[PDB]
Amino acid sequence: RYRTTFTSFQLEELEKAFSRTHYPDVFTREELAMKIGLTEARIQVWFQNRRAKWRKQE
DNA sequence: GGGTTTAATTAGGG
DNA sequence: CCCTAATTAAACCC
């Protein structure tokens, strides 16, 4: 099973995107993908896990 | 190595 | 496709 090891860069940008919105549109997601060198799919997945984590800390 | 985090997958909702 | 909760398993880090 391949697992992505995100760089600190990818991670800080994912988090900055998340403060902006928990549910980014397609365009936001594809723009971020071009920026940080991840697929939209992996961003979507990161966002799924980020939202469940965020949810649990309430 | 093992406990914690967390990327990825599964099985469920419309 | 838009998601979820729960699970699985790999990476991080002491």
Could you walk me through the main structural features you see in this protein, from its secondary elements to its overall organization?
This protein is an all-alpha fold and 58 residues long. The chain has one domain (1-58): Homeodomain-like (Arc Repressor Mutant, subunit A, Orthogonal Bundle). The chain has helices at residues 8-20, 26-36, 40-56. The radius of gyration is 11 Å and the shape is globular. The chain binds a DNA duplex (14 and 14 nucleotides) through helix 3. Involved in the morphogenesis of proximal and distal pattern elements in a subset of appendages. Also has a role in early imaginal disk development. It is found in: Nucleus.
What would a concise description of this structure say?
This is Homeobox protein aristaless. This protein is an all-alpha fold.
In the CATH scheme, the class would be Mainly Alpha
Estimate percent helicity: over 70%
**Largest pleated sheet:** none
Q: N-to-C SSE series?
A: HHH
Q: Hey, roughly how much beta strand do the residues contain?
A: under 5%
Alpha carbon gap, first and last residue: 32 Å
Q: What global shape is seen?
A: globular
Rg on CA atoms, Å: 11 Å
CATH topology: Arc Repressor Mutant, subunit A
User: What is the CATH homology-level superfamily?
Assistant: Homeodomain-like
CATH architecture descriptor name:
Orthogonal Bundle
Give me the count of strands. 0
Tally of DSSP helical segments: 3
Assign the structural class, choosing from mainly alpha, mainly beta, alpha/beta, alpha+beta, or little secondary structure: mainly alpha
Q: Count the domains.
A: 1
PDB class: gene regulation/dna
Keywords: homeodomain, protein-DNA complex, Developmental protein, DNA-binding, Homeobox, Nucleus, Gene Regulation-DNA complex
Assembly: trimeric
Entry title: Structure of Aristaless homeodomain in complex with DNA
